[PDB]
From a paper:
Here, we focus on the mucin-selective metalloprotease, [name] ([name]), which is known to cleave between adjacent residues carrying truncated core 1 O-glycans. The M60-like or Pfam 13402 (PF13402) family consists of hundreds of enzymes from organisms known to inhabit mucosal host environments.
[name] consists of an immunoglobulin-like fold domain followed by a catalytic domain. The active site harboring catalytic residue E326 contains a beta strand and two alpha helices arranged within the larger gluzincin motif, characterized by histidine residues H325 and H329 and glutamate residue E343 bound to a zinc ion. Sequence alignments of [name] with active, structurally characterized PF13402 enzymes highlighted conserved tryptophan, glycine, asparagine/glutamine, and arginine residues that interact with the initiating α-GalNAc of mucin-type O-glycans, as exemplified by a cocrystal structure obtained by Noach et al. of BT4244 with a serinyl Tn antigen. Notably, these S1′ subsite residues are spatially conserved between [name], BT4244, ZmpB, ZmpC, and IMPa, providing a rationale for the specificity of these proteases for substrates carrying mucin-type O-glycosylation, a property that may be shared by the entire PF13402 family. The active site beta strand is positioned further from the gluzincin motif residues in [name] compared to related enzymes, preventing the formation of hydrogen bonds typically observed between metallopeptidases and their ligands. Comparison of the catalytic helices between PF13402 enzymes revealed that [name] and BT4244 have longer helices containing a spatially conserved aspartate residue. This residue, together with a semiconserved Y288, forms a surface that sterically blocks accommodation of a G2′ sugar residue. Notably, a cluster of aromatic residues, formed by a nonconserved W149 present in a long loop as well as residues Y287 and F290 in and around the active site beta strand, was observed adjacent to the active site. Unique to [name] was the presence of a long loop that, based on molecular docking, could interact with a glycan at the P1 position via formation of a hydrophobic pocket consisting of residues W149, Y287, and F290.
Residue numbers in the entry: 20 to 506
Write the structure that this text describes.
């Protein structure tokens, strides 16, 4: 009764369709079955209480994270594990039945979320590194025999260009175990959450909200979240939603379908890579990020907002020198929306930046402090928020999505002037003086040290053409000196 493609293939003929969730009406017993896997399934069905949940599901294609990023001019650090199954695969040989693919590329992901450094290895210096290791198995239409060496939650990788059009692909983990998952968009409640954790067969529970996906250990979810899984997911959704709102993605119907992943790791306190945000699986860190109130406080809120803001910061607001500047517009907004302190206020940044840049008569580009560069960007928001344009950044980011050019490396300085034009046009305000005082219009050749090093050439013509363009609009000047705004 071995689970060979020939034994399994013969058995497939006994079920009503390729889902194998029901038997042909003349199949009364299991005497004709050739495979252990399909016989065991048919025995469940014949006994009248088969639960296909999770084990069998149909998977919808998502836009690739890189397409999503390109469309919005932002990063592609969205979840590769978005199509969670709620299926856990024990060590052994598994049978996975895939429906019609129409040649679509589709694979199975088995990440090692519980990977730890070897005994006596310093976690930060792990020779295996800090990345999320996984087995990736290409799937074909039909019978897939998959050898699992270490037990794993399963995730489907199914991404295309034109996701609304691609087929739904059925996948049946015949030999799997239903770990389940928590999904607030499905209507799951705290009752569901407690039951999920109590009956979990994996050390990892998968959960998602509107925008967040989390992959955290059951032990920490029970210890700290306990009861409040809905609140936890809502809190991460609030943090991400704050960025989408500031981006104007809600206003203009452009919230991406892709989730952002926050995961456990066993190497380091907190970091972000291409897979998303990672948090150390110890009591200290897990208390901060698996408790729904703690995740919205101070350092936890800032750290998450700061990192996600690297995915969400758009290229036209993130020219050279701006990598650690434009993402913190999100951090400041998230602090304002969660009742936390202003870090610009706490650092005395308005004063530090006015002294460094305005009094120092340097170019904005030459500023040596990423909080000082953040100051005018935040003053604009605080000003326009009070003076009749509450959708300031939402409209500016939409305008730049639609109108900004396409620049890389040393050419990215052109975005500085495009950003200035966008702010004027959106608000119908002549902001020449504000930007002049903050040194946006200083000509020269500037060498700027970000992660990359930039050589910007701001010519007198570039400055004059921007100023001419603004003057030509005939907008009113603000009544007050916006550079004087402080908290
Ligand atoms: Cl920071
Ligand atoms: Zn950063």
């Amino acid at each position: 009764m071995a689970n060979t493609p020939e034994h399994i293939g013969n058995d497939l003929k006994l079920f009503k369709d390729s889902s194998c969730t029901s038997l042909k009406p003349d199949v009364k017993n299991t005497s004709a079955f050739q495979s252990d896997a399909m016989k065991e399934l048919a025995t469940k069905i014949l006994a009248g209480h088969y639960k296909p949940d999770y084990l069998y599901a149909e998977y919808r294609a998502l836009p690739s994270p890189r397409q999503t990023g390109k469309n919005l001019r932002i990063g592609d650090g969205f979840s590769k594990y978005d199509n969670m199954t709620g299926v856990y695969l024990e060590k052994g040989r598994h049978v996975v039945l895939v429906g019609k693919t129409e040649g679509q590329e589709i694979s199975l992901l088995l990440p090692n979320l519980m990977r730890k450094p070897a005994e006596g290895v310093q976690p930060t210096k792990d020779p295996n590194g800090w990345g999320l290791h996984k087995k990736q198995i290409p799937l074909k239409e039909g019978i897939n025999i998959i050898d699992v060496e270490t037990p794993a939650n399963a995730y489907i990788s199914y991404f295309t260009e034109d996701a609304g059009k691609a087929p739904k692909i059925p996948v049946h983990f015949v030999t799997g175990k239903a770990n389940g998952y928590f999904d607030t968009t499905r209507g799951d409640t705290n009752k569901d959450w407690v039951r999920l954790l109590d009956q979990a067969v994996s050390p990892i529970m998968d959960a998602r909200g509107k925008y967040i996906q989390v992959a955290y250990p059951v032990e920490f979810l029970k210890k700290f979240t306990k009861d409040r899984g809905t609140e936890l997911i809502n809190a991460y959704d609030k943090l991400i939603g704050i960025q989408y709102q500031l981006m104007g993605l809600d206003k203009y119907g452009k919230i991406p379908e892709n989730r952002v992943l926050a995961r456990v790791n066993f190497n380091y306190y907190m970091f972000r890579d291409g897979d998303g945000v990672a948090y150390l699986g110890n009591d200290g860190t897990m208390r901060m990020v698996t408790d729904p109130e703690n995740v919205l406080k101070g350092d936890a809120c800032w750290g998450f907002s700061h990192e996600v803001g690297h995915v969400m910061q758009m290229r036209p607001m993130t020219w050279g020198g701006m990598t650690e500047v434009s993402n913190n517009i999100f951090s400041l907004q998230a602090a304002a929306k969660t009742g936390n302190e202003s870090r610009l206020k706490r650092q005395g940044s308005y004063d530090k930046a006015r002294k460094e840049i305005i009094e120092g008569e340097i170019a904005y580009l030459q500023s040596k402090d990423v909080f000082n560069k953040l100051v005018p960007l935040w003053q604009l928001h605080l000003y326009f928020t009070k003076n009749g344009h509450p959708d300031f950044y939402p409209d500016v980011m939409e305008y730049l999505r639609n109108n900004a050019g396409n620049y890389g490396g040393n050419d990215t300085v052109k975005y500085q002037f495009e950003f200035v034009k966008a702010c004027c046009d959106v608000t119908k305000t002549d902001l020449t003086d504000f930007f002049e005082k903050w040194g946006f219009f200083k000509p020269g050749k500037f060498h700027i040290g970000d992660y990359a090093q930039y050589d910007f050439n701001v010519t007198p013509e570039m400055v004059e053409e921007t100023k001419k363009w603004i003057a030509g609009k005939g907008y009113p000047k603000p009544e007050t000196d916006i550079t004087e705004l402080s908290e």
